[PDB]
Design a protein around this ligand. Sequence first.
Ligand code: NA
Ligand code: NA
Ligand code: NA
Lengths: 196, 198
Amino acid sequence: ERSRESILDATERLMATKGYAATSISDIRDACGLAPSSIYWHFGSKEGVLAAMMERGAQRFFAAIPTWDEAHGPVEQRSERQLTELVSLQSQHPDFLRLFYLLSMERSQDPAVAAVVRRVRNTAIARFRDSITHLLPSDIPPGKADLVVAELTAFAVALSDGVYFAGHLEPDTTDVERMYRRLRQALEALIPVLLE
Amino acid sequence: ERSRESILDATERLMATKGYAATSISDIRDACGLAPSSIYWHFGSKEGVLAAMMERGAQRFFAAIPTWDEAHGPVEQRSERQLTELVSLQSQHPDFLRLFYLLSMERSQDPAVAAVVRRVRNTAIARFRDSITHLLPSDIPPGKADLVVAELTAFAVALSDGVYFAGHLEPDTTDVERMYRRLRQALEALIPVLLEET
Ligand code: NA
Ligand code: NA
Ligand code: NA
């Protein structure tokens, strides 16, 4: 819908400017022109707006990174982009990232929000899993591979989570590209260890 | 002195139940018997209390792990309980940890809170750095060591941050001990890599 996008657009700018608490459903109307009843009719509530806002922020973050089959090149890589995008995709668009980590720790969470948080986290995990499976030798038995891949994935996701906070808490001295370089180097080193 | 402790104790329990939002200065009095005016006089405000409580939780988290110099004797070398002490304390807090990440991302928060967050983060970084220096060969030129230790530390702290969220978002399938073992193994692998790159 054209109207759904209007609301989210307004909600982004308003919360960026005023923060969550001080952003009214009324304010959102003032910005997007849509009446509160129309807003409620779409997202059901303020939290329902926040969720949908946060989700499509994810959908764009992930689309800006190609999957492994979205490639291209003779397995250049198939790092290239995947790290390069991930690197550039932390440049003051954590945005959605900060919101994610905030919402992940929220207590007594609205169902719509908890569902969005879960889908985003699962997606991120799935995406790392897609890349990492290609770091293993092909002659590894699939069941054994599943265990190794799952453990490397959990490791990478953890490190990537840490990268946001490093950039947030130590923005001056943090090198995002360098850190993800150490990650892939760490993963390549851990593969022989895991198969032992 | 004893008054500060009973205020924080009451504030913990009240904030374990109830939400931060729904915990009033009034409620805190009801629990600890100290008047609101006495509470303010100590911590200055509600978020002023929140800070002090979160810091105290960190100081206890950090004391529960030894520094390299105070650790044992030299066998482990000194790490594998500094490991399990780190593993001991997840266990999935707060205590402090969830509050820390929440407060670290809070906007326009409060001078006293931002200071606590900064001290806790810096301490944790300092603690990892203290351990990691002994992973390097003795003959590395100090200035070059400083660069390598710093990069390994940033890496370790990042991984440790992610370990919390793994345990939070995937509590069923997350092995905390196994993860910190992979961190140690990763750090040992990265040391030669870092030294040949200066
Ligand atoms: Na209108
Ligand atoms: Na309308
Ligand atoms: Na040595």
